[PDB]
Amino acid sequence: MKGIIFNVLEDMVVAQCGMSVWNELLEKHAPKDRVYVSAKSYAESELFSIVQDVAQRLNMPIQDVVKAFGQFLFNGLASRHTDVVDKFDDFTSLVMGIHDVIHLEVNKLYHEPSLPHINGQLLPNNQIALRYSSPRRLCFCAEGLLFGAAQHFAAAIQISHDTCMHTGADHCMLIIELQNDENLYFQ
Ligand code: MNH
Ligand code: NA
Ligand SMILES: [Zn+2]
């Protein structure tokens, strides 16, 4: 798990809960003097432990917190990699380019990142079938990231997530419905 994910998580915790809370989390869940260098890889268990601790403090379902993080994360990533996001003029383009364009670039920017496998298929009625696969099972982070992307393009979406690795499949299916964006009028 790259430092950049931890750095965006810090911004979130610091913004919502305060710096004193982040330092608690970090002292408790990370080795002494840990510093997350944005480009370096770190044990994903440190990220999961921090986020689980937050979920418990807030008495929220863990996957609801991961999803909220995901949505915060989209802007954290777009603002730190603005040249990658500015390759797309709308939400649907970006989603269709996650694998072959965005995460292709992430392999040139970072040494050996740990990324999901994603394939998007355009459906009728302004829907997208996004297939997600990862041993890290962060499909709810992916839901949040899609909601973040929607907000980035002033779009409105809904997601159905009825095949899921957490319910025993070897992939998740996220069926994205684009309800509105700047190029959608009546239908
Ligand atoms: C919506 C769009 C979108 C989705 C659904 C998305 C999906 C994900 C998910 C889920 C993970 C966590 C790991 C896993 O195995 O699931 C992940 C990781 C990552 N992605 Mn992307 N990602 C972006 C946009 C997206 N990515 C953008 C924009 C950037 C920035 C250029 C980016 C860069 C990354 C980096 C960096 C990681 C972390 C890799 C690592 O920790 O080793 N990405
Ligand atoms: Na519109
Ligand atoms: Zn899932």
Tokens representing 160 are 């159905």
The kind and range of the H/E element at 163 are strand 156-163
Nearest ligand 1 atom, CA 85: 28
Classify residue 68 as left (phi > 0), alpha (psi -120 to 50) or beta: alpha
Q: Give the count of domains, the chain.
A: 1
Identify residues whose C-beta is under 5 A from ligand 2, the ion. Answer: 180, 184
Q: Which CATH number goes with the domain that contains 86? A: 3.90.1520.10
State the residue range of the domain holding 70. Answer: 1-187
Q: Which amino acid is at 13?
A: V
Query: What is the spatial distance between Cα 122 and Cα 151, in angstroms, rounded to a whole number?
Result: 20
Query: What is the spatial distance between Cα 157 and Cα 76, in angstroms, rounded to a whole number?
Result: 20
The structure's method of determination equals X-ray
**What are the beta bridge partners of residue 118?**
132
Query: What is the spatial distance between Cα 133 and Cα 122, in angstroms, rounded to a whole number?
Result: 18
DSSP state of 162: E
Question: Between the CA of residue 17 and those of 24, 50, 58, 83, what are the distances in Å?
Answer: 11, 13, 10, 31
Nearest ligand 1 atom, CA 139: 10
CB of 66 within 6 A of ligand 1: the answer is no
Query: What is the spatial distance between Cα 175 and Cα 162, in angstroms, rounded to a whole number?
Result: 9
